[PDB]
Ligand binder design. Structure first.
Ligand SMILES: [K+]
Ligand SMILES: [K+]
Ligand SMILES: [K+]
Ligand SMILES: [Mg+2]
Ligand SMILES: [Mg+2]
Ligand SMILES: [Mg+2]
Ligand SMILES: [Mg+2]
Ligand SMILES: [Mg+2]
Ligand SMILES: [Mg+2]
Ligand SMILES: [Mg+2]
Ligand SMILES: [Mg+2]
Ligand SMILES: [Mg+2]
Ligand SMILES: [Mg+2]
Ligand SMILES: [Mg+2]
Ligand SMILES: [Mg+2]
Ligand SMILES: [Mg+2]
Ligand SMILES: [Mg+2]
Ligand SMILES: [Mg+2]
Ligand SMILES: [Mg+2]
Ligand SMILES: [Mg+2]
Ligand SMILES: [Mg+2]
Ligand SMILES: [Mg+2]
Ligand SMILES: [Mg+2]
Ligand SMILES: [Mg+2]
Ligand SMILES: [Mg+2]
Ligand SMILES: [Mg+2]
Ligand SMILES: [Mg+2]
Ligand code: NA
Ligand code: NA
Ligand code: NA
Ligand code: NA
Ligand code: NA
Ligand code: NA
Lengths: 152, 136, 53, 105
RNA sequence: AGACCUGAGUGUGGCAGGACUACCCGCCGAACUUAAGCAUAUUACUCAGCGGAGGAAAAGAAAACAACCGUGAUUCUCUCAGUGAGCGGCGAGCGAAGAGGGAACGAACUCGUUGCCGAAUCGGGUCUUACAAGGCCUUGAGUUGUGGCAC
RNA sequence: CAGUGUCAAGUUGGCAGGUAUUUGUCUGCCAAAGUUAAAUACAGAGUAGGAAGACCGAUAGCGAACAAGUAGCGUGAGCGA
RNA sequence: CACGAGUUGUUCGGAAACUGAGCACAACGUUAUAUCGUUUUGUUAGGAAAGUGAAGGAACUGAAAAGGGGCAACAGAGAACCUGGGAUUAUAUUCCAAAAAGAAAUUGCAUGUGGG
RNA sequence: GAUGCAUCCAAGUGGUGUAUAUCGCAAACUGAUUUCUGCCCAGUGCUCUGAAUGUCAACGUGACGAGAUUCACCGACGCG
RNA sequence: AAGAAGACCCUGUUGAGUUUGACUCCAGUCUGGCUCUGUGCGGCGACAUCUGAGGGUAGGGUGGAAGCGCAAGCGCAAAUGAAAUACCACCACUCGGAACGUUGCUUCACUUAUCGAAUGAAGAGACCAAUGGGUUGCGUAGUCUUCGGGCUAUGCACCGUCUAGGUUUGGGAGUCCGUCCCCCUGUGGGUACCCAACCGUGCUGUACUGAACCAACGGGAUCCGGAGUCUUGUUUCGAGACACUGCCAGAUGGGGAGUUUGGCUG
RNA sequence: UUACUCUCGCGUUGUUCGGAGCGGGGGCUCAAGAUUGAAAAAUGCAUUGUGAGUUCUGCGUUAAAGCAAAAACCUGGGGU
RNA sequence: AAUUACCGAAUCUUUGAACGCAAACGGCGCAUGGGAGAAGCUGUGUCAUCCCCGUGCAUGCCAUAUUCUCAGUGUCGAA
RNA sequence: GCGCGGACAGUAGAGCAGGGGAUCCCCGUGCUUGGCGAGUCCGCGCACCA
């Protein structure tokens, strides 16, 4: 509430006392859209493009998160991906589901590598069946305006 | 609530008759369960009885009555010193309190309880064992 | 400690809810002076102790 | 538990026995020389205290026996904290005359 | 000041965990198998699993049977009875009870309530040759009720 | 019998009386605290004593008539002469 | 195979006595069942888990200090000794005897000399 | 966009990606550059519609009946 | 020739792995209801009761009552119909209102259940004052009384009270002005304010690496304030009686389980 | 310290450095080594110079990779 | 009686439910009783550090305190 | 098997195949049985023990 509209902020508290949960990845920030002095709420634009309102008591850091521009440099090498994920978690390399056998994946098997059924699966699919394009509203190459992702 | 069958990932095996996970009910009542938890936790006491006091949507509260079998007041009382004798150790674990008798079917007598007296196993034993008379 | 918080919150919750008359009547005590006088009269006529009996 | 004596004022009222609800079962226990006491009944006193007993009966009846309709009718509780009452006060003060122009006169 | 009443600390006195587990008591709980297949059924309220006690356990003094000229706590035996009971893809299969002859049997008691009392109760010290079912003392516990008496 | 919901009556009363219901008769009994010996079990138990057998007779009979749950095997659970 | 021997430490390695990936006693919760779960992202547990520096008239009393007790490295951290021996059948930076072959370092207590 | 998505667990004030926060995380497909990636939404999926103007569950509501019950009405996702 | 009870092929009322839009199901997901679950204001309806107010072609019934009604009209007689109206009495179905009780949904305002975060539960709110609280008061007007005093409105009072800073109303008293020493000069030490009002809300700092703890100081007989006080009490913040707990119900559901997938046959 | 006035200077094998103080003179300090002696000849066996290897040590690029922690110990800042 | 048999008295190492804390450690503590004890002191006693032995010390629960010590914006209440 | 909507809108009109004059108007054309209850075909969504 003490920050002028149009100011660029990062490390934004979703709830007062959160100690910062929004706009923390390198290069990311929020934009303050407006204040509602009656309700005591501030409306802001998140990096994803969604607009969210939080109590005006939530704290923000002035500026943008450092380290921006990282994803612009091609990795070029499997070894560079290896070192990138070394400090994160065991999630790489990635084996395609159609390269697996039907015992361990719905996409497995066949005498050609193929998904034999539509890869868009329901939101209600149980774990083990919910693989592929999960509850996709649309598929294929996005033409024209990219719609803001996430829920409504 | 009802008992959830503790199978991995809710998966059962064998005949479809045994495939239920969420709809089975524990064959003991909750009062007997509360008495058993009290008795297991404090093995130096003798559980005597219990009664309902309150319940929530999540919880049920039962007050359990327990006796210290080493207290001289208990040991010299002809009304309660029966429980000092070691045959009454953990009687709630064996379904011997009022709640245990209730879920054993022992509130009934005669033709409503013939297959469960003096116990289900006792009646099964005397109904299913092959008798070989000496001269037959 | 948990019990301190619980007794305080119990007083709060007893005040915040709608107390039916059968329970509410016990907050409508006798006045101070009559209470002292009645307590003194009862103290006059207390039972015998163990040794007096 | 309050259920031990929750019925006692009603039983006293039904039999037309003067009763008082007083503070602190521990003070009652102090009177009879005990730790606590739920209730005490006076059956008779000597002549030196007949007048005191009668005056006590009168004031006790004023508070309790004569007020049976109110006592039977009166719901309690519904009390706000100090912070809530002050907040309602401040709100009524802020919106003290917002609708003054809506009035025809 | 202090009280009680809710909860802690320490001292003192004690108890539980483990083992056994044939039989017994409480839960939990299959599948092979049989149905000439198989899913209900069957195997089986069994095995495996988790708890608990004893010298036996459990049961047990009618909210019982009967429908009689009536019986009379429990348990067990023969029998009722593989049943002109019943259950059952009414298939495979399953499946008791009362009465009757018997074993046992000194088998009966307690509380709570009611109503008449109301600390007469308990524990602890200490005397009696005595951690007395005794005397004395004792606020310690108990009147938010222990103990007596009665159908 | 169990979970959950819902929940009495008061002996002008309840429960039972093996085809659901509503009536009105009859009969038996009085649930929702508790203790209790014997007659029964010991279907892979123990302690101290006993008695036997139309049983087996060292590849049999317990795995074990013997320094046998031993020697040996297995990472181990166990296996086991 | 039989008989009889052989491994010597203030300092070497470990432990007393560190933290790591981790483990899981307590506590609490769950489960018909604890033989289940949580238990280092500063950190147990609705959670009152600290028991003694001081003083003050020899052991009795008590301030402030937030987040219980352990374990997990014989290659990480750490750790005061090293040469000579004609000293063995076999041990040795471990044994050697007042000329300790000898030379050191380092703990813990005590005794003196001296202090400014 | 975190009272989230994916997701472990028989269960809990339980667990993982998350010591994170869209330049993040999770789920697929293709397989370096280069040059390109056409047409088809009928089918089956997936998705949305802030009509869901038909269809249902039990929960309710009413009526008939001495009552057990019978009928009627309401009834959400979803399907259409 | 040996090595292995053919692995090919068939048969069996033998399997197992895998698939699915096979049969029969189960977790998971979603959805409805009840529950958790409290307060107060309103809104739309429903129920009970008073009561409007009209009225297949047209001139709704259905009955007593063919005569009186102040007046004087309706026929048993004129007009119809798939039905012919009197004076007392006689309403179909809709529409309309309270004024009470209950309440099914629902808007809003709440806050104590509950949910979500944070924190070493580290400073909440008020004093700025009610549509507040109380015999641990005082009146008034009704209305009751067990005669002691209540209840409902109404007012007065008590609970109940202090502030950085900003702006302006009154007070003198020491010496900006100047003063009190030492060396025209230089330097060193201090005060140059208090009260009251409105605002404000608990406020001594600001608009590329410092130090800060175990107060001094001032009063009263060691306490006190310095360092305000208070508590119808919630650690604080955000939601909030829904979205979270249990039960019941429907759909979905190869993610998973079980099982089946005839026979004859050159 | 007119050091850098229009070719600044110093220095590495090597990627530098300097008015935020180069270079020269004179000093302070740390780390590696030297040299002298005590040990020590009383021991050991039957000698004092150079060149090549050798990582103790000194010199304090890949990275969307930036390369543990604690005990113990050390010193100061405050106070006695 | 190194006989046997039986049984009342005794002994009974390290562990193990194992329970002061640990553990591929014959490890390490706190409290409390003891033992031994060099150098100094008048052979004797005494004895710091070190060393040895006994006892108690897990968690929970019950009872209890000749009436122990406390906590709570729980409820009261002093005179 | 149960319920719905429909045999274009209905309480017999509308769309429009074929008709006169200059795309306009006008002729035509059109689910059963009973005094508003009981059957036939399409679909939908739902039930499935000979
Ligand atoms: K067969
Ligand atoms: K008999
Ligand atoms: K032989
Ligand atoms: Mg492959
Ligand atoms: Mg698959
Ligand atoms: Mg495939
Ligand atoms: Mg391919
Ligand atoms: Mg492909
Ligand atoms: Mg089977
Ligand atoms: Mg078999
Ligand atoms: Mg088969
Ligand atoms: Mg078993
Ligand atoms: Mg028995
Ligand atoms: Mg018994
Ligand atoms: Mg042989
Ligand atoms: Mg043999
Ligand atoms: Mg050898
Ligand atoms: Mg760790
Ligand atoms: Mg360690
Ligand atoms: Mg060492
Ligand atoms: Mg290519
Ligand atoms: Mg063959
Ligand atoms: Mg198969
Ligand atoms: Mg296979
Ligand atoms: Mg399958
Ligand atoms: Mg064939
Ligand atoms: Mg242990
Ligand atoms: Na699939
Ligand atoms: Na045990
Ligand atoms: Na035993
Ligand atoms: Na039930
Ligand atoms: Na709050
Ligand atoms: Na499936």
């Amino acid at each position: 509430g003490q920050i002028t509209e149009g100011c660029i902020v990062c490390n934004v508290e979703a709830k007062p006392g959160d100690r910062g949960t929004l706009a923390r990845a390198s290069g990311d920030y929020c934009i303050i859209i407006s204040h509602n002095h009656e309700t005591g709420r501030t409306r802001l634009k998140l990096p994803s493009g969604q607009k969210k309102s939080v109590p005006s008591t939530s704290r923000a850091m002035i500026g943008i998160i450092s380290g921006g521009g990282r994803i612009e440099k091609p990795v070029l090498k499997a070894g560079n991906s290896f070192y990138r994920f070394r400090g994160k978690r065991n999630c790489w390399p990635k084996v395609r589901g159609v390269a697996r056998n039907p015992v361990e994946h719905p996409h497995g098997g066949g005498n050609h590598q193929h998904i034999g059924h539509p890869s868009t699966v329901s939101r209600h699919s149980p774990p083990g069946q919910k693989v592929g394009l999960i509850a996709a509203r649309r598929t294929g190459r996005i033409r024209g305006g990219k719609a803001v992702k996430g829920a409504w | 609530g009802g008992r959830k069958r503790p199978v991995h990932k809710g998966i059962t095996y064998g005949k479809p008759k045994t495939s239920g996970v969420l709809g089975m009910k524990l064959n003991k009542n909750n009062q007997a369960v509360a008495e058993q938890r009290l008795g297991k936790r404090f093995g130096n006491l003798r559980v005597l009885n219990s009664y309902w006091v309150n319940m929530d949507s999540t919880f049920k509260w039962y007050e359990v009555i327990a006796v210290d079998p080493m207290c001289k007041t208990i040991r010299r009382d002809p009304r309660i010193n029966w429980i000092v004798n070691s045959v009454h150790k953990h009687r709630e674990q064996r379904g011997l309190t009022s709640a245990g008798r209730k879920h054993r079917g022992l509130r009934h007598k005669g033709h409503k309880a013939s297959k469960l007296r003096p116990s289900y196993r006792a009646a099964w034993r005397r109904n299913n064992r092959i008798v070989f008379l000496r001269k037959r | 400690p948990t019990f301190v918080t619980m007794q305080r919150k119990k007083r709060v919750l007893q005040r915040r809810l709608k107390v039916p008359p059968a329970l509410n009547q016990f907050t409508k005590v006798l006045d101070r002076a009559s209470r002292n006088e009645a307590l003194k009269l009862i103290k006059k006529y207390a039972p015998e102790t163990r040794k007096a009996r | 538990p309050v259920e031990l004596v929750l019925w006692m004022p009603n039983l006293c009222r039904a039999n037309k026995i003067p009763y008082a609800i007083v503070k602190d079962m521990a003070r009652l226990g102090d009177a009879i020389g005990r730790k606590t006491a739920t209730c005490v009944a006076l059956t008779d006193v000597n002549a030196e205290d007949e007048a005191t007993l009668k005056n006590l009966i009168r004031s006790v009846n004023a508070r309790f026996l004569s007020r049976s309709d109110v006592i039977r009718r009166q719901w309690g509780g519904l009390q706000l904290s100090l912070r809530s009452r002050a907040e309602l006060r401040k709100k009524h003060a802020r919106n003290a005359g917002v609708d003054a122009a809506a009035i025809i006169q």
